[PDB]
Design a protein that fits this description.
little secondary structure; RNA-binding; about 40 residues; 1 chains
Length: about 40
RNA sequence: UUUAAUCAAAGUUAUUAUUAAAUAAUAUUGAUUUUGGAUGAAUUUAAUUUUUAAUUAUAUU
């Protein structure tokens, strides 16, 4: 394995929302993002 | 008994029900019976990305 995985299929903003297609978060995202992205905005 | 043959359909019916849908801010380890069963790895889902987290303006770039 030169590179483990190049061009990961997440780079396309695949909408994997738990209420939309049934898949939860991708494993790379943390399961508990304490504060949403609005509170950091 | 004779019908020469034909020609019409208009306007009322029993005996029993309380379910759906939206709304309400006070629950929560998966809905459909008794694990493993050797006493052990079966029943493990974790990682800084608009995520069951959902954003009071018409300007500038």
């Amino acid at each position: 394995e030169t590179t483990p995985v190049k061009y990961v299929p997440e780079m396309l903003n695949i909408q994997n929302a738990k209420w939309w297609n049934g898949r939860g978060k991708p494993v790379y995202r943390s399961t508990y993002n304490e504060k949403s992205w609005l509170e950091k905005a």
